[PDB]
Design a protein around this ligand. Structure first.
Ligand SMILES: *[C@@H]1O[C@H](CO)[C@@H](O[C@@H]2O[C@H](CO)[C@@H](O[C@@H]3O[C@H](CO[C@H]4O[C@H](CO)[C@@H](O)[C@H](O[C@H]5O[C@H](CO)[C@@H](O)[C@H](O)[C@@H]5O)[C@@H]4O)[C@@H](O)[C@H](O[C@H]4O[C@H](CO)[C@@H](O)[C@H](O)[C@@H]4O)[C@@H]3O)[C@H](O)[C@H]2NC(C)=O)[C@H](O)[C@H]1NC(C)=O
Ligand SMILES: *[C@@H]1O[C@H](CO)[C@@H](O[C@@H]2O[C@H](CO)[C@@H](O)[C@H](O)[C@H]2NC(C)=O)[C@H](O)[C@H]1NC(C)=O
Length: 417
């Protein structure tokens, strides 16, 4: 189903800086170096470029939700809204947001109110369930509880699916080269950090509910799972297992939906989620490094407006970029590229062997040096991949070939090409 190799030339692992660092500069005179990234995409949506479009929930058709005081917008619930009116506006929204018909960048839809699986609408999302029950109870006033539940569950899930599949399908009909997918899907729901037996595994019937979203995976042309690291992870040893299984679940549903090649691009932050606490180098490896080592197509680094608001914040990002983040980005991007070239003939991604569950794609500091060019050109890389570095890759990593290239080493084009 998917036929893209590396999303950008020489980039098995691509990075998108999704930060308003433009504000840091224009408002505060703080100049954050963003040259290490493949893509800079302002979440403030200042320009319309070839590499990323984002649709926030108020930008693509008529997305129904409840305000936090419970008032409906466009009907609150997909079964209480007009799909036909949504699709009309969606058609026009896509053409205005994405003027090039051959646009081939990320096309991220950000729908975070209700979830398509009835089971996942818990906590503050239980309003979608309560209101689903209310809607059938008003239409049929003399109806017992387990009967409004089952009718509510089917109406909701039926509607939620028509809306999400129809929007993705229309996006792809109009822009067939867009890497269309929803932010935050799949979710592994492995937030059980306080439990003795924490493995990071997606609980119980979570995977089973995700299998019921095969229709969603089929309609997707990239997957954008979130690997934001909750505040509670800070200073424990559970970050890597949490991330590992969230990335793995995105590959798992891709393979089961008959698209082993579906680009997976997790969303990450450089802070613990909801905080101004920068991720230690450590935690970068456990998140961006982890994603690359599973063969992620790249990562989207989302930086909240909360973190680029002030001069102080912006200046702490500038310095984090120089000391920690930027060298790390070049490190992981180059490790992935060099491995692809040395192991996979330049025609596949290196992916962990299962015998080496924690291996990462990084540069040996004995073979390479990453340094800032004086005055401040971009980071340079000096040195060379040693024969021992290459021997270590051969033991830790195998190949997942780009579509069209044959396993195991991606040396020859495949059969039906
Ligand atoms: C490319 O990117 C990766 C960035 O992740 C760089 O590799 C990382 O470098 C950092 C800092 O230099 C390392 O952090 C230190 O780790 C040690 C523990 O080291 C041992 O355990 C690791 C896994 O558990 C393992 O990977 C290590 O093996 C490598 O590292 C050494 C060099 O340190 C080298 O000799 C080997 O050949 C391997 O390459 C090793 O077995 C930890 O003790 C360190 O302590 C620091 O922090 C504590 C705070 O608690 C402080 O008390 C210490 O004194 C010290 O400051 C430190 O965290 C990290 O292990 C590396 N990660 C990996 C996966 O290699 C790499 O350098 C970059 N390359 C380029 C070209 O720049
Ligand atoms: C179903 O959708 C309708 C809109 O068609 C919702 O009705 C609106 O409700 C608000 C606040 O309760 C009123 O101010 C509007 O006048 C209503 N609009 C119209 C034109 O009817 C209704 O609340 C939704 N039902 C559920 C269960 O969410």
């Amino acid at each position: 189903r998917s036929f893209r190799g590396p999303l950008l030339p020489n980039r098995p692992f691509t990075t998108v800086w999704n930060a308003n660092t433009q504000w840091c500069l224009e408002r505060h005179g703080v100049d954050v170096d963003v040259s290490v990234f493949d893509v800079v995409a302002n979440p403030g949506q200042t320009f319309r470029g070839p590499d990323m479009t984002i649709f926030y929930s108020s930008q693509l058709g008529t997305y129904p939700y409840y305000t936090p005081t419970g008032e409906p917008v466009f009907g609150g619930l997909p079964q209480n809204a007009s799909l036909i009116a949504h699709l009309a506006r969606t058609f026009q929204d896509i053409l205005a947001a994405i003027p090039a018909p051959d646009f081939s960048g990320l096309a991220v839809i950000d729908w975070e109110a209700w979830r398509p699986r009835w089971a996942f609408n818990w906590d503050t999302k239980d309003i979608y369930r309560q209101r689903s029950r209310a809607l059938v109870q008003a239409q049929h006033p003399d109806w017992p509880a387990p009967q409004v539940e089952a009718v509510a569950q089917d109406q909701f899930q039926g509607a939620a699916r028509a809306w999400m599949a129809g929007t993705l399908q229309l996006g792809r009909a109009l822009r067939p080269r867009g890497l269309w997918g929803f932010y935050g899907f799949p979710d592994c729901y492995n937030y059980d950090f306080l439990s003795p037996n924490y493995t990071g595994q997606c609980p119980s019937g979570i995977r089973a509910q995700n299998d019921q979203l095969g229709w969603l995976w089929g309609q997707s042309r990239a997957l954008y799972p979130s690997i934001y690291m909750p505040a509670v992870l800070e200073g424990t040893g559970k970050s890597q297992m949490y991330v590992q299984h969230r990335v793995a679940e995105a590959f798992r549903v891709a393979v089961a939906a008959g698209d082993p090649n579906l680009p997976v691009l997790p969303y990450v932050q450089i802070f613990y989620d909801t905080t101004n606490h920068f991720l230690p180098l450590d935690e970068l490896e456990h998140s961006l490094g982890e994603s690359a080592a599973q063969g992620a197509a790249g990562v989207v680094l989302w930086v909240s407006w909360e973190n680029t608001r002030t001069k102080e914040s912006c200046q702490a990002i500038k310095e984090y970029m120089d000391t920690t983040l930027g060298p790390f980005i070049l490190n992981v991007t180059s490790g992935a590229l060099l491995c692809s070239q040395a192991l996979c003939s330049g025609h596949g991604r290196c992916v962990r062997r299962t015998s080496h569950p924690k291996a990462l794609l990084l540069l040996n500091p004995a073979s390479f040096s990453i340094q800032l060019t004086p005055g401040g050109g971009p980071l340079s890389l000096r040195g060379a991949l040693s024969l021992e570095d290459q021997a270590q890759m051969a033991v830790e990593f195998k190949c997942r070939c780009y579509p069209g290239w044959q396993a195991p080493w991606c040396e020859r084009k495949s059969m039906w090409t």
